[PDB]
Symmetry: C2
Subunit: 134 residues, 2 copies
């Protein structure tokens, strides 16, 4: 899904960086059950919408308007997998693979809801941090 | 994609049904705001794998199996409202529209974990009895 697939790769770009690593398109086609060929359609499209820029070293640069939005999918991602865990108590194992889906359907007003409602924001149940204070 | 789309279709054919409006496509075009030339593409397409029938009385008449694919999506639909209000808190006239998203993610794994976490799973916010339950 276009809008959803931007979020999907903008999610891996954050996830590599935090992992400590260069957001190199290649890296992503082993991350994703995907290919170079398609991966360039996505970072070609994306960059022109203004989200990522292709360069050398680590290579892929999320723009000012690239960060603020994957910062979001990711806290959306780190806050729903906690609602599925802290509140419903989902088996764990399911929790990420499933919160990879609630991260697109969750809303900003439901975030504020979960900020007044959870007993620890801070870290994903897998430890490691949840960002957006906006 | 088009699986959550037959999950919208079966959810209005089942909703109109439940409210008494007999489900003749122009109502499906109106309720789902895509047009009716758009809606026969999809009603007719959900029929190739026998989910609906077009026939006099009821005009759309969803099969032993499409009706399963409707009762489900209406059960992760009422249960999402019951999350959204009962453990979260979204105003209320905001709560439907979120669950219309969440009725497509929300696994079996998840609303079965929900029924042990809510203290009245027989209610809807919006009157309507929660269909499914297993």
């Amino acid at each position: 899904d276009l809008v959803d697939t931007t979020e999907m790769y903008l999610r891996t770009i954050y996830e590599l960086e935090e992992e400590g690593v260069t957001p190199l398109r290649a890296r992503i086609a082993e991350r994703l059950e995907q290919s170079g060929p398609t991966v360039s359609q996505t970072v070609a499209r994306m960059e022109r919408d203004g989200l990522v820029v292709v360069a050398s070293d680590r290579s892929l640069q999320m723009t000012p308007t690239g960060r603020t939005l994957a910062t979001a999918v990711m806290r959306k991602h780190r806050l729903a997998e906690r609602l599925l865990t802290d509140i419903i108590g989902l088996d764990i194992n399911k929790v990420h693979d499933e919160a990879c889906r609630w991260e697109h359907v969750m809303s900003d007003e439901v975030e504020r809801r979960l900020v007044k409602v959870l007993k620890d924001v801070s870290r994903s149940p897998f430890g490691n941090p949840i960002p957006g204070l906006d």
